Enzyme design. Structure first.
Site, short mmCIF file in Angstrom:
data_model
loop_
_atom_site.label_atom_id
_atom_site.label_comp_id
_atom_site.label_asym_id
_atom_site.label_seq_id
_atom_site.Cartn_x
_atom_site.Cartn_y
_atom_site.Cartn_z
N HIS A 41 0.80 -1.22 0.00
CA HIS A 41 0.00 0.00 0.00
C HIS A 41 0.84 1.27 0.00
CE1 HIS A 41 0.15 -0.37 4.58
NE2 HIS A 41 0.28 0.94 4.47
N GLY A 143 2.92 5.79 10.06
CA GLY A 143 4.25 5.68 9.53
C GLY A 143 5.02 4.46 9.98
N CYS A 145 4.17 1.29 9.29
CA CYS A 145 4.05 0.14 8.40
C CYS A 145 5.40 -0.22 7.80
CB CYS A 145 3.04 0.43 7.30
SG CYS A 145 1.38 0.37 7.99
C1 YMG Z 1 0.96 2.14 8.04
O1 YMG Z 1 1.99 2.90 8.60
C2 YMG Z 1 -0.33 2.36 8.85
C3 YMG Z 1 -0.21 2.13 10.38
C4 YMG Z 1 -1.49 2.18 11.08
C5 YMG Z 1 -1.96 3.61 11.15
C6 YMG Z 1 -2.13 3.95 12.47
N1 YMG Z 1 -1.72 2.73 13.38
C7 YMG Z 1 -1.34 1.71 12.60
O2 YMG Z 1 -0.99 0.66 12.98
N2 YMG Z 1 -1.37 1.54 8.24
C8 YMG Z 1 -2.52 2.13 7.59
O3 YMG Z 1 -2.67 3.30 7.57
C9 YMG Z 1 -3.53 1.18 6.96
C10 YMG Z 1 -3.44 1.32 5.45
C11 YMG Z 1 -4.36 0.33 4.76
C12 YMG Z 1 -4.36 0.52 3.25
C13 YMG Z 1 -3.94 -1.09 5.11
N3 YMG Z 1 -4.88 1.50 7.37
C14 YMG Z 1 -5.32 1.43 8.74
O4 YMG Z 1 -4.68 0.89 9.57
O5 YMG Z 1 -6.52 2.05 9.05
C15 YMG Z 1 -7.02 1.78 10.32
C16 YMG Z 1 -8.52 1.53 10.17
C17 YMG Z 1 -9.25 1.44 11.51
C18 YMG Z 1 -8.92 2.60 12.44
C19 YMG Z 1 -9.60 3.87 11.93
C20 YMG Z 1 -9.47 2.29 13.82
C21 YMG Z 1 -7.42 2.83 12.57
C22 YMG Z 1 -6.74 2.98 11.22
#
Ligand code: YMG
Ligand code: YMG
EC number: 3.4.19.12
Lengths: 302, 299
Positions: A41, A143, A145
């Site tokens: 992603h 950040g 990931c």
């Molecule tokens: C990548 O760095 C990031 C880390 C996430 C963001 C905040 N804490 C983490 O562990 N991953 C993402 O942003 C991820 C991207 C998708 C395309 C896989 N999306 C994500 O984690 O969204 C979550 C959805 C549920 C809620 C809103 C509770 C938290 C963010």
């Protein structure tokens, strides 16, 4: 008490962390030999993350769209491919700090160290357990990931986890280093529910063995059980059933104490059915389930 | 919210093995000097009352075997500073990080790189207890393992490991070789002073739990600083100073919970217990996160 979560030394993994940027989206990657591994992603805009078409997004990409940096030093990308949910970026330099390594896919209950990284720079290291519902209780922020989880055996780093996302309940989800998610999750910015979590039986048994090793053995009873009978009772208390692999990894602790695995299962069953009765084990009324049989041996025997 | 150690690679590149006679422990190799616990020079019949100056003057440079992996380092001189031996070697460590030696205060935290035979084995976070012990995980051969913090690219070394107490906690020195606490590097069973709980750290951790959406322990009440400290001292908690209140400012602001309101929450927990409930997975009040630690991990 006397036990704590202990991570592996992180230096061999620190020497493999880089940053990967597409546009303004930056995350971490793992540089081994001449390949950098990272979550696919990275190629998504925030608007793409709702329901990304990864295949279409990848065909619009070229090598020169990927900015890979070790610190501030750019690593030229000379090829790219997608394997499941990970991107493999071929680079023109073999990482001189590449350790001996393997890629392993772990089972629920297994523990591993996480080197939490931001912008290719390590922030901290800590131990995580893979829950039975295939989530981990990490400490991940925006950040993070591409941060990886690992174990170290002798000189060899076994990479087992790469971080991709957070769930509504605040726990975390990701893939192995072949890009296959643990659990039923997908890398979309959609709401996804983890299954109901359960207690890691094999690790509770390891904990009881650790108690016995330290002379705390009031809970040992005179009975035994079959594995099936234990598994059926255990599930009624929201404990995971044991696998044959669980029985085998308890083997060394069983041999160290002379207590058959199924005899310890009978002792645990009595704890579940009858409760603790205000007593403690290793100084607590709560049974710990995030120390594996390997973790116990490390801290009891070195 | 997890107990997080600093990345250990900069320290791993400094760990070596030091042997004298049949004693082996770890050393810290910075530039052309290896630092290690001086009791490496002791035999069995020495440990009970070692006259270290007398034992050391009888040693020669070649009595010290220093190994960095597969390579032996030649010792070309030695000196003693308090309880630490400084072995000069003929080779500089190219992996020497930017570093300093600091003496930490009780209640401060640091990462431990536990090593055996000069090989790093695990990393974990400890606090300097108010009674100057540390609740470590150290086995035979761990001496010379070090504790540290990292600020930017600078490693601040604050602890070197020397001994275990009968209660299972641990004691050691700063990198000048001065013990933390009333302990002595002789082979005796030693007891510590009464330990107390690090109150400012408990408060920081309660704030952490709120930040993570957990606030069952909050209540509608407040307390004065002094009334809180009276109750804290009764339960063998350290007093809270105004500097501690100031240090907690950022967490108070972030959460909208006044420091003395959180003190009234902690007071209730001390008097009413947790009654089955848990905070951040724990059934006990955790006191080895500092305010800085909680913030560094919410940023
Ligand atoms: C990548 O760095 C990031 C880390 C996430 C963001 C905040 N804490 C983490 O562990 N991953 C993402 O942003 C991820 C991207 C998708 C395309 C896989 N999306 C994500 O984690 O969204 C979550 C959805 C549920 C809620 C809103 C509770 C938290 C963010
Ligand atoms: C150095 O590697 C070693 C580490 C100790 C050993 C066991 N766990 C540890 O942390 N330190 C010593 O052996 C130390 C040497 C003296 C000269 C300072 N002695 C020591 O720690 O003795 C202890 C006394 C109490 C008991 C028997 C409970 C444990 C050992």
């Amino acid at each position: 008490s006397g036990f704590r979560k202990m991570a592996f030394p992180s230096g061999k993994v620190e020497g493999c962390m880089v940053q990967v940027t597409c546009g303004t989206t930056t995350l971490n990657g793992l540089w081994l030999d001449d390949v950098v591994y990272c979550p696919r992603h990275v190629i998504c805009t925030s608007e793409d993350m709702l329901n990304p078409n990864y295949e279409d997004l990848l065909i619009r990409k070229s090598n020169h769209n990927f900015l890979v940096q070790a610190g501030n030093v750019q690593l030229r990308v000379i090829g790219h491919s997608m394997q499941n949910c990970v991107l493999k970026l071929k680079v023109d330099t073999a990482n001189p700090k590449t350790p001996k390594y393997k890629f392993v896919r772990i089972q629920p209950g297994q523990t591993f160290s996480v080197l939490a990284c931001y912008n290719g720079s390590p922030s901290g290291v800590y131990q995580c357990a893979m829950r039975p519902n295939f989530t981990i209780k990490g400490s991940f922020l925006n950040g993070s990931c591409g941060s990886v989880g690992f174990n170290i055996d002798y000189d060899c780093v076994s990479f087992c986890y790469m971080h991709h996302m957070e769930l509504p309940t605040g726990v975390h989800a990701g893939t192995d280093l072949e890009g296959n998610f643990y659990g039923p999750f997908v890398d979309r910015q959609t709401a996804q529910a983890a299954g109901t979590d359960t207690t890691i039986t094999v690790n509770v048994l390891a904990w009881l063995y650790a108690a016995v090793i330290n002379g705390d053995r009031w809970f040992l009873n005179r009975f035994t059980t079959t594995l099936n009978d234990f598994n059926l009772v255990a599930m009624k208390y929201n404990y995971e059933p044991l696998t044959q692999d669980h029985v085998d990894i308890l083997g060394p602790l069983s041999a160290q104490t002379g207590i058959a695995v199924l005899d310890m299962c009978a002792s645990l069953k009595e704890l579940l059915q009858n409760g603790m009765n205000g007593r403690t084990i290793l100084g607590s009324a709560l049974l710990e389930d995030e120390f594996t049989p390997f973790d116990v041996v490390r801290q009891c025997s070195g």
